[PDB]
Amino acid sequence: TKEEAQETRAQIIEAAERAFYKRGVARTTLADIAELAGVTRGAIYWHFNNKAELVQALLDSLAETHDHLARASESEDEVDPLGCMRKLLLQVFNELVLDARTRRINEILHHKCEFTDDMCEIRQQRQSAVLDCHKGITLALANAVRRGQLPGELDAERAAVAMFAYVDGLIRRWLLLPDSVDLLGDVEKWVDTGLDMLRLSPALRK
Amino acid sequence: KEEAQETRAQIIEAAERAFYKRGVARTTLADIAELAGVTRGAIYWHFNNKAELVQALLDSLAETHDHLARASESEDEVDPLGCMRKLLLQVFNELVLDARTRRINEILHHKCEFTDDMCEIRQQRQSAVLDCHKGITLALANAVRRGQLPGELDAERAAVAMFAYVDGLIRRWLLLPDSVDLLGDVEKWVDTGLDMLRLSPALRK
């Protein structure tokens, strides 16, 4: 009845994430996710071609929550684009630490999903995603410079890589050793340590 | 006889090729033995399970940097901060240049799952990071003492920040080599990371 297909998909997705978190992506099959989703076998192949399409869905969903701050950080009309970036990072960290779903998915993508020459689509998927994410980050920086919020001579793309790298690295750290990083208690410091890298670093300028 | 030393080297060498090509999850020791041209008896002599083999590749990264790391960790070293810079340049150089080191980092980052069906994997990376962390913090506490980093700089946090950034950049470079002239701009990349520690108000107490 249409709501069926929609809820069945979410039912697959939510079970892909249980399976993947437990067994890793490499040895979990579509068929195993279907049996776990309590979904008639053949169903899973209507909603997802391979396992990679299913991992990509998990990764795309991570973007939903942050679309608004992200899209604001990227709008030239935006008044406080570095202000939106800041609140974006805050939120990314808050969700990471607060949201079981979000954390599970990051743990899957960071620590439970091999890139194989076998399943080439996985790596490629990640590449395209990190590249999209990079375009986004570079824009917002470009906006923050234009508004006089970042150094005028900042290298927008290098500062983006720098920034993504520190955020991506911190997330992985916290996922591996949670109790070494008060990610939530000290968010502001963590977000600011990084934004501090972007507006105060001489290396990062041209 | 220490001919054990050669066959062991050919197992490890073969484990890199197989884990790299096929990932850890579905590569068996019997798979690696074949590739290594050794017997399953031999491989299982040297390695009880894959988790020891992976641990082997992991452990091997440290060797090259031992001197430069011990240097920055020495309270008696005058330029602890310059040792850490030179150590990071070295870390980045080896990654770009050394097929081996690249393949191993690639295996660790992109090709090796933490599955509690193999919990030693995760537990063994936790240990190397917590160790690596005490080594970074010492390098920092020292450099703060020699008037190289702020006096009020939260050392343990700086250390996490430093590590995240490096780890983050290495992983970005493996995923997308052509967006990080890791080797041509290494100094810039290393210094972007120092600048953060030395210049960033947020990292202070």
Curated annotation (Swiss-Prot), chain A:
Keywords: DNA-binding, Repressor, Transcription, Transcription regulation. One of its GO terms (molecular function) is DNA-binding transcription repressor activity. Induction: Induced 4- to 8-fold in the presence of toluene; this is controlled by TtgX, a possible efflux pump global regulator. Induced by chloramphenicol and probably by tetracycline. The keyword Transmembrane does not apply. It holds the Pfam family TetR_C_2. Residues 29-48 bind DNA. Gene3D superfamilies: Tetracycline Repressor, domain 2. Residues 6-66 form the HTH tetR-type domain. GO terms for cellular component: protein-DNA complex. InterPro entries: DNA-bd_HTH_TetR-type_CS, Homeodomain-like_sf, HTH-type_TetR-like_transc_reg, HTH_TetR, Tet_transcr_reg_TetR-rel_C_sf, Tscrpt_reg_MAATS_C. Coiled coil: none annotated. The keyword Transcription regulation applies. Represses expression from the ttgABC operon promoter and its own expression. Binds to a promoter region between the divergently transcribed ttgR and ttgABC genes/operons; in the presence of chloramphenicol or tetracycline this binding no longer occurs and ttgR and ttgABC are derepressed. This suggests that TtgR binds these antibiotics. Homodimer. This is HTH-type transcriptional regulator TtgR. It comes from Pseudomonas putida (strain DOT-T1E). The lineage of its organism: Bacteria, Pseudomonadati, Pseudomonadota, Gammaproteobacteria, Pseudomonadales.
Swiss-Prot record, chain B:
GO terms for molecular function: DNA-binding transcription repressor activity; transcription cis-regulatory region binding. Coiled coil: none annotated. PROSITE patterns: HTH_TETR_1 (PS01081), HTH_TETR_2 (PS50977). Residues 28-47 bind DNA. Residues 5-65 form the HTH tetR-type domain. Induction: Induced 4- to 8-fold in the presence of toluene; this is controlled by TtgX, a possible efflux pump global regulator. Induced by chloramphenicol and probably by tetracycline. Keywords: DNA-binding, Repressor, Transcription, Transcription regulation. InterPro entries: DNA-bd_HTH_TetR-type_CS, Homeodomain-like_sf, HTH-type_TetR-like_transc_reg, HTH_TetR, Tet_transcr_reg_TetR-rel_C_sf, Tscrpt_reg_MAATS_C. Pfam families: TetR_C_2 (PF08361), TetR_N (PF00440). Homodimer. Represses expression from the ttgABC operon promoter and its own expression. Binds to a promoter region between the divergently transcribed ttgR and ttgABC genes/operons; in the presence of chloramphenicol or tetracycline this binding no longer occurs and ttgR and ttgABC are derepressed. This suggests that TtgR binds these antibiotics. This is HTH-type transcriptional regulator TtgR. It comes from Pseudomonas putida (strain DOT-T1E).
